[PDB]
C-alpha cells in the first residue's frame, strides 16, 4: 500500500488553510468549552476534503459569480454565486456552502472586481475595495448569494470576483474565528459540516498553524488558526495514502542538527495534538519541519513539550 | 544502473491549477504563433528535477506580493517608499544571486491591490490600516533588487510601519502598456538585470510554446488581464518536493480525458520547465473540464510530436 507522508516544508513555506496568507508560527491553546469546528482547512489524512475546503490558496475566502442586483441595503451589492471554477453552484449539494466560503464571524475585506460579458460594453472592467460581513443577514452563501459593501458605486450587473485581503471586527460585532456563520441566514441550521475536533485526553492540546492577517483599522491582532496548512491538504489529496490507524506519529525535526525537537499526534480527521498545559506560542528553528515516523494510536503517550 | 525516483506530474485539472506568475486560477490553455516578443519570465520558473529559478518561490500568496517597511513619504508619483524584507520576514540581501526578492513581479505595467500596516514600537503599537495601493513596475522607484519599491495610494493614511502589499490584479500604467513579456528594471534606470532565468523558445520547426493562461482582474479600461505562465504553480511545488532526476532534456506528456480514457494531444515538457506543441498559429484550446497532463516517457530533442 502507498506509504503516508508529509511534504517537506518549513513554516514560512506553508499557507494558512483558512485564510490566503503564509503561516507565521505554531501555537498550542489551552483547552476550553468552546468548539473547534472550522470548515476551511479540513481534510482527512487519506485525502478526503471536508466542509468547504478546496485545493487552491486563491480559493480561500474568495467568491466568484455575478452581481444580479444593486440594492439599498448597507450591503448594497447582491452577488449571486458560482462555484470558484465558474460552474453553476447547486444549493442542494451536500456541502455547507460553496467551497472556499469564509468559516468565521466578522468581516473579510478585499477587492471586488468585474469584467463585462454580453452586449453591454463587453470586456470593460472595474475594481474597488469591498467588504463582506458574515454577520450580515444577506450572507447566505449556502442559498447561493452574498452581498458586499463598497464606498464606490461604480459597479454593474456583471461577472464579479471577490479577492480577500484581510479580516476585521464588524463594528460592535467581534471577529470570532471559531464561530461559524449561518450559511443559510437567520433562523436556519448549518448542514454537512465537518465535525468538531478536540483532544481525547486533558493533558493534550490542539496545536495550530497560526497566521496574523491584515486588518483594516483598530487593534485586532488578526489571528487565524488552522488545523493543518493548505499544502498538507494538497499533498494528502494527491497521495491518497490509506490511513493505517486513527493516529499518525509526527516529529518536528531540525534538519540543520538532525535533532528531533518534539513529537505530536496527527489524527486521521486532520488535526494535531501535543502534550502541553496552557497557552503556548512555540519557538522553533527556521528550517524545522514535521516528519511522519509511524502509525500509532490514541493510547500513545506523547512526550511533554 | 542504480534506480532513480520516477518523474511525474500532479493530477490536477485546469481549474485546480494556480497561475505561477499571478495568484489566481488557470483559465485556459493557449499556444502562440512565434513572434517578435521574447519569453523570459522570472516567476513560475522551475526545472523538472525541482530547482527553482529566477524570482520563483513556493507560495501562491508570495506571487507579486511584497513585505517590508514604509521608511519614507516622498514627492514621487509613487509616494510611499517601501524598504523590502524577504516574504518570510528575514532581512533581504541585495548581494544574493537572485534578480530581485522572490515573488517580485516579472512584467512591465501596474499591479493593483491593498497595502496594509500593523504598528510596532512606541507609536500606537498594534494599530492597523489598509488601503488600495498601486505599484508600477515602470517606475524609476521600482528598484526591488536594490531593496525597495514605491507604491501609490489615493489614501494618505499611511505610517512608517511594517507593511504588506497584497496583489489583486494588473493594469496598464496610464500611457505605458501592460507587457507581460517585458521584464522590469529590477535595479532601476540604466542598470542591468542579473541572475535571470534564461529566455525560452521552441528549438524545433513546426513547434510552438504552450501556455497556462489566466485572465486576471483589471482596475478599469478594457485590458484583458492576460497572464501566461510556462508551468502552473502546483507543478513547481510538486517538482520541488519530488526532485526526480531528469532522464533527458525532454519529457513526453499527454493530455488525457479520464472520463473516456482518450488521449487528446501530446506535448514536449522541456527540462527547463516549459511546454511546446506541434501547431501553426495562435490557438486557444478547447479541452474537457476534467482533463489533465500525464507524463508518459522521456524522449529527445529530435522527437516529432503528433500535430494538434
Amino acid at each position: 500500500s502507498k506509504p503516508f507522508s508529509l511534504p517537506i516544508l518549513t513554516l514560512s513555506e506553508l499557507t494558512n488553510s483558512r485564510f490566503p496568507v503564509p503561516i507565521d508560527s505554531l501555537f498550542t491553546a489551552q483547552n476550553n468549552v468552546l468548539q473547534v469546528q472550522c470548515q476551511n482547512g479540513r481534510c482527512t489524512l487519506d485525502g478526503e476534503l471536508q466542509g468547504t475546503t478546496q485545493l487552491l490558496p486563491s480559493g480561500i475566502c474568495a467568491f466568484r459569480g455575478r452581481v444580479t442586483a444593486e440594492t439599498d441595503h448597507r450591503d448594497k451589492w447582491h452577488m449571486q454565486l458560482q462555484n470558484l471554477n465558474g460552474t453553476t453552484y447547486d444549493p442542494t449539494d451536500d456541502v455547507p456552502a460553496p467551497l472556499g466560503t469564509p468559516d468565521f464571524k466578522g468581516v473579510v475585506f478585499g477587492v471586488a472586481s468585474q469584467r463585462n460579458v454580453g452586449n453591454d460594453a463587453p470586456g470593460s472592467t472595474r475594481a474597488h475595495e469591498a467588504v463582506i460581513s458574515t454577520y450580515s443577514p444577506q450572507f447566505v452563501p449556502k442559498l447561493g448569494s452574498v452581498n458586499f459593501r463598497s464606498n464606490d458605486n461604480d459597479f454593474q450587473l456583471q461577472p464579479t470576483k471577490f479577492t480577500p485581503v484581510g479580516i476585521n471586527d464588524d463594528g460592535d460585532h467581534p471577529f470570532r474565528q471559531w464561530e461559524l456563520p449561518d450559511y443559510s441566514g437567520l433562523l436556519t441550521l448549518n448542514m454537512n459540516l465537518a465535525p468538531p475536533v478536540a483532544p481525547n485526553f486533558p493533558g493534550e492540546q490542539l496545536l495550530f498553524f497560526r497566521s496574523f492577517v491584515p486588518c483594516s483599522g483598530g487593534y485586532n491582532q488578526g489571528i487565524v488558526d488552522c488545523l493543518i496548512p493548505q499544502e498538507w491538504i494538497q499533498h494528502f489529496y494527491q497521495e491518497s495514502a490509506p490511513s493505517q490507524s486513527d493516529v499518525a506519529l509526527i516529529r518536528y525535526v531540525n534538519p540543520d542538527t538532525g535533532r528531533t525537537l518534539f513529537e505530536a499526534k496527527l489524527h486521521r480527521s486532520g488535526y494535531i495534538t501535543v502534550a502541553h498545559s496552557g497557552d503556548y506560542p512555540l519557538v522553533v528553528p527556521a528550517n524545522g519541519y514535521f516528519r511522519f515516523d509511524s502509525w500509532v494510536n490514541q493510547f500513545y503517550s506523547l512526550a511533554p513539550m
Side-chain angles (χ1 to χ4, degrees), chain A residues 1-152 154-305:
Chain A
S1 55
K2 192 180 195 325
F4 177 72
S5 65
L6 304 176
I8 302 183
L9 295 162
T10 67
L11 229 48
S12 65
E13 293 166 335
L14 294 168
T15 306
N16 201 296
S17 60
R18 297 196 43 227
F19 205 76
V21 294
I23 295 301
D24 288 300
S25 61
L26 296 166
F27 181 87
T28 181
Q30 177 167 255
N31 297 315
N32 62 34
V33 76
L34 303 188
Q35 284 207 304
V36 173
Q37 210 185 342
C38 54
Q39 299 303 303
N40 285 319
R42 305 296 304 261
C43 185
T44 67
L45 296 191
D46 59 23
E48 182 187 328
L49 309 179
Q50 309 201 310
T52 58
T53 298
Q54 46 75 63
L55 299 172
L56 280 63
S58 298
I60 307 169
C61 289
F63 288 115
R64 180 190 195 151
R66 298 187 56 107
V67 168
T68 56
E70 171 186 355
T71 75
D72 61 357
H73 293 114
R74 179 197 188 184
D75 316 313
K76 172 181 266 308
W77 301 99
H78 184 98
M79 194 180 170
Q80 202 172 86
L81 299 175
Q82 301 170 292
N83 298 311
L84 286 168
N85 62 11
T87 61
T88 302
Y89 169 68
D90 176 11
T92 71
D93 201 6
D94 59 341
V95 290
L99 302 186
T101 296
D103 63 353
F104 51 81
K105 269 189 162 137
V107 316
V108 42
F109 67 90
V111 172
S113 67
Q114 295 189 326
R115 180 170 274 114
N116 293 18
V117 303
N119 299 342
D120 187 355
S124 66
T125 65
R126 54 216 64 87
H128 307 291
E129 289 201 65
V131 172
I132 297 168
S133 165
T134 60
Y135 277 101
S136 182
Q138 284 76 242
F139 184 80
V140 288
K142 171 56 166 172
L143 299 186
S145 68
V146 300
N147 283 33
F148 65 82
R149 333 162 176 164
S150 196
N151 287 336
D152 215 305
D154 179 36
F155 279 109
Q156 295 181 26
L157 305 195
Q158 292 284 354
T160 301
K161 293 173 174 181
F162 177 81
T163 306
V165 173
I167 279 160
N168 218 331
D169 304 292
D170 189 9
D172 296 316
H173 304 80
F175 164 64
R176 292 290 166 79
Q177 72 161 322
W178 300 122
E179 279 171 39
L180 292 179
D182 302 307
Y183 293 118
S184 304
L186 288 176
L187 312 178
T188 61
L189 296 177
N190 292 331
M191 291 176 308
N192 303 290
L193 300 169
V197 306
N200 295 313
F201 303 98
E204 279 180 28
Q205 287 179 173
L206 292 176
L207 178 71
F208 297 115
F209 300 80
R210 174 164 282 191
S211 289
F212 310 92
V213 318
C215 292
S216 51
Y219 289 73
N220 202 287
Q221 300 170 300
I223 295 167
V224 173
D225 293 309
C226 71
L227 307 177
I228 49 174
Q230 185 63 23
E231 285 81 3
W232 287 22
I233 292 171
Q234 295 173 313
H235 180 74
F236 301 157
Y237 177 84
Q238 286 306 306
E239 292 296 292
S240 284
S243 306
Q244 297 308 307
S245 72
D246 286 342
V247 188
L249 178 64
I250 61 172
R251 273 65 177 272
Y252 208 84
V253 67
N254 188 338
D256 302 335
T257 65
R259 296 180 67 250
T260 290
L261 303 194
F262 71 95
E263 60 181 5
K265 285 172 175 176
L266 174 59
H267 302 256
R268 88 180 292 135
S269 298
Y271 66 96
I272 307 179
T273 57
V274 287
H276 190 92
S277 195
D279 283 342
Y280 176 32
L282 284 69
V283 175
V284 288
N287 292 336
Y289 61 89
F290 275 118
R291 183 193 68 216
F292 166 68
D293 284 348
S294 184
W295 291 101
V296 286
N297 45 65
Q298 298 88 330
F299 306 90
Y300 188 98
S301 305
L302 292 161
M305 51 84 62

